[PDB]
Amino acid sequence: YHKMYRTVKAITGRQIFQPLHALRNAEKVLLPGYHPFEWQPPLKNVSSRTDVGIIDGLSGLASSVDEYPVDTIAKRFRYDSALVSALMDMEEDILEGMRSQDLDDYLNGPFTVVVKESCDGMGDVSEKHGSGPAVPEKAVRFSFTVMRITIEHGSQNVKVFEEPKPNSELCCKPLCLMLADESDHETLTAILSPLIAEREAMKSSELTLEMGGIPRTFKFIFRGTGYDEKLVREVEGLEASGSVYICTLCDTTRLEASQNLVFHSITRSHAENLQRYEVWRSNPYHESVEELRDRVKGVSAKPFIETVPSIDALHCDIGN
Amino acid sequence: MSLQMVTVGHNIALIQPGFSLMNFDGQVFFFGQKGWPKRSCPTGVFHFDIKQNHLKLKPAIFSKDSCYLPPLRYPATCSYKKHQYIIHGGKTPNNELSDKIYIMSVACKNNKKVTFRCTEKDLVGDVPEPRYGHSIDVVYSRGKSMGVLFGGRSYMPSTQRTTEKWNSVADCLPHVFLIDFEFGCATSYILPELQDGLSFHVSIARNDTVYILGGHSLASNIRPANLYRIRVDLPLGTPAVNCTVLPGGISVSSAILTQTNNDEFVIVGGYQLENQKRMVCSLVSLGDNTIEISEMETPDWTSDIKHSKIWFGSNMGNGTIFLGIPGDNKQSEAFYFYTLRCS
Amino acid sequence: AAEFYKIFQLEIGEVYKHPNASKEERKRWQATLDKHLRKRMNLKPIMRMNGNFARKLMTQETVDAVCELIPSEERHEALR
Ligand SMILES: [Ca+2]
Ligand SMILES: [Zn+2]
């Protein structure tokens, strides 16, 4: 861009393109940590500062010689700041959507925003030379997408903004990038737990933002659909590879899955996974390993992400 | 001072820094794996057997009434007197701390197979906060056996935690706790002779005293060359705890304890500074009321040990110490494991 | 540069005094050389060597870092 700007200026005489420092100054309007926002009620264990930007993804993890060795690099945004920036980037879009439905403009009803959470690891990313720990040649990305924004009008609920192309690269807004391995569980939990804490805090609060000259309040609902089967199993419970238990939505075993396969019902959740893990760890009924596994229905770990029990269409097509 | 290289089977990706090795009736077992339990070993314990310098990990089944406990990544080791084994707290693989207590025991043993019995107990009274890196040990005073606890490292309290510093740790309170295993009780005791915290230290048992020496204090980022001797008696009323500062202590943190002979323990490994490693060995000769730390000849290390940054290990019990060196990048098999013999 | 890398691998073990060696010993030599190279000169271990690796390995700091792992001094001066 600098070469283009320099040559265009040199030839035409005028200044058609803007300089790099001007672009950098205009950049800060869109990046997280520029707009003032207030939470009501205040988020639990989340600071109220409105100037937080690119913070280390390690979340102040210990890196001394006497404790668990860390060999990852991670940079991430605060969830609330990222969502504030995402909402303000589509400020004119939200105004246009509210206008097109024959509603008001300065209406300050509580917006019900649904956000899809997507996380997928990668492979074959080359490690650089240079200062840093022995960071493995794998990367894991965490990103969020904004599907629908609704405001409460009258008695029913009216829609404002729907993503036209949800599966595009122009709406998968990044949230946390760590260059680690998804096979490892300790580092994954260590880097990803603060984001889950922020999400849980935001699940029970409201955000006030000066939206186009009139203050409006937001409420958020989250859905973690953008995971593949291996990550779902490695996060919210059931053992990896291929077990006797297969589906992530029901307690159906492989044999009766092959037998009936037409009559079922979705049963699994996250609270049920936590209760089943507690049952597995305590063994109140004094059962052996096999009958305890049959009682616990396959979960043998502590889940830490509330993943919506859904199916991923892309990997479904690939496997099928 | 024998240094023998040991090979490992198809479970090398299952040992991580911070494990713990327990010795039951001359048999050494394993605990504290990497990752959650798999379908191959739903329990988490293993048959840590070395024959001809080859390591094989066979699963070991728990009892019917035992509790299937998560892998603690940094527990506290205790050896009660019927021969049991006690672990307290630590990090789960999801990186949350636990304030719970577990006691190891053998429910039944048959030919070439062993079944464990892990029990669940709840502490009432002055319950210690969840932590890791601490040390626990038991004393036998006036015919009464009762365990003592010391502070370590823990996360910031639930009032000053922020997500930006979610994983920042702070040393626990200097308080010294007394644990009554047979009843599940604990009464806090604050002693003016202990003002600063202490983490990753070694605990040595005796008839009525515990010798805590070395360790790392995070507040001042220093490793004191101190040595505290805590003498506890068991009268009819409340217990009396006395801490006395002794001269001649060494400055080592995250060291390894071994019991070679009666009234004779050896210290090897650890870190002196953040970028420095403990290249020497200390032989602690206990007595009735006397402690004399002397420097014995340095065992013949290899280049890989002398040039590495990290080592970790636990106690075999039978005069052997199992320490490992990080092999190489994941890209031999990411870990090199050695064994060490002390007479 | 590849030939010098092999020279360093055989020198960090003093093969001039041990004419016979097994595969495991050479693998250990590879691992320790890669580890020290990373530690000191900040070079990652790679399977197909580039030209940047050649230019960085062809420095005096390279023989310094390799030689402090060699117990003898005659090998030190020879490599230097
Ligand atoms: Ca993928
Ligand atoms: Zn199903």
From Swiss-Prot, chain A:
Effect of gene knockout: Mice display a severe combined immunodeficiency phenotype. The have a small lymphoid organs that do not contain mature B and T-lymphocytes. The arrest of B- and T-cell differentiation occurs at an early stage and correlates with the inability to perform V(D)J recombination. The frequency of homologous immunoglobulin pairing is much lower. No obvious neuroanatomical or behavioral abnormalities have been observed.
Effect of D80A: Loss of DNA-binding
Tissue spec. comment: Maturing lymphoid cells and central nervous system.
Compartments (UniProt record): Nucleus
Signal peptide segment: none
Variant or mutagenesis effect after changing D228A: Loss of cleavage and strand transfer activities without affecting allelic exclusion
Source superkingdom: Eukaryota
Effect of E117Q: Impaired cleavage
Domain notes: The RING-type zinc finger mediates the E3 ubiquitin-protein ligase activity.
Effect of D120N: Loss of cleavage (both nicking and hairpin formation)
Function field: Catalytic component of the RAG complex, a multiprotein complex that mediates the DNA cleavage phase during V(D)J recombination. V(D)J recombination assembles a diverse repertoire of immunoglobulin and T-cell receptor genes in developing B and T-lymphocytes through rearrangement of different V (variable), in some cases D (diversity), and J (joining) gene segments. In the RAG complex, RAG1 mediates the DNA-binding to the conserved recombination signal sequences (RSS) and catalyzes the DNA cleavage activities by introducing a double-strand break between the RSS and the adjacent coding segment.
Protein family: Belongs to the RAG1 family.
PTM text: Autoubiquitinated in the presence of CDC34/UBCH3.
Positions with a binding annotation for a divalent metal cation: D120, D228
Protein name: V(D)J recombination-activating protein 1
From Swiss-Prot, chain B:
One Gene Ontology MF term: phosphatidylinositol-4,5-bisphosphate binding
Keywords: Chromatin regulator, DNA recombination, Metal-binding, Nucleus, Zinc, Zinc-finger
Entry keyword Nuclease: no
Principal place of residence: nucleus
Cellular compartments annotated: Nucleus
Knockout consequences: Mice are viable but fail to produce mature B or T-lymphocytes. Very immature lymphoid cells are present in primary lymphoid organs. These cells do not rearrange their immunoglobulin or T-cell receptor loci. Double knockout with TREX1 does not show a visible phenotype.
Cellular component GO terms held in the UniProt record: nucleoplasm; nucleus
Tissue localization of expression: Maturing lymphoid cells.
Coiled coil: none
A GO BP entry: T cell lineage commitment
Known role: Core component of the RAG complex, a multiprotein complex that mediates the DNA cleavage phase during V(D)J recombination. V(D)J recombination assembles a diverse repertoire of immunoglobulin and T-cell receptor genes in developing B and T-lymphocytes through rearrangement of different V (variable), in some cases D (diversity), and J (joining) gene segments.
Domain notes: The atypical PHD-type zinc finger recognizes and binds histone H3 trimethylated on 'Lys-4' (H3K4me3).
Family named by the database record: Belongs to the RAG2 family.
Subunit structure: Component of the RAG complex composed of core components RAG1 and RAG2, and associated component HMGB1 or HMGB2.
Protein name per the record: V(D)J recombination-activating protein 2
Species the sequence originates in: Mus musculus
Full protein segment contained here: 1 to 351 of 527
Swiss-Prot record, chain C:
Compartment(s) where it occurs, according to its Swiss-Prot or TrEMBL record: Nucleus
Post-translational modification: Autoubiquitinated in the presence of CDC34/UBCH3.
Taxonomic superkingdom: Eukaryota
Impact reported for E11A: Impaired cleavage
UniProt remark on domains: The RING-type zinc finger mediates the E3 ubiquitin-protein ligase activity. The NBD (nonamer binding) DNA-binding domain mediates the specific binding to the nonamer RSS motif by forming a tightly interwoven homodimer that binds and synapses 2 nonamer elements, with each NBD making contact with both DNA molecules. Each RSS is composed of well-conserved heptamer (consensus 5'-CACAGTG-3') and nonamer (consensus 5'-ACAAAAACC-3') sequences separated by a spacer of either 12 bp or 23 bp.
Family designation: Belongs to the RAG1 family.
Protein's recorded name: V(D)J recombination-activating protein 1
Gene it is expressed from: Rag1
Whole-protein coverage range: 801 to 880 of 1040
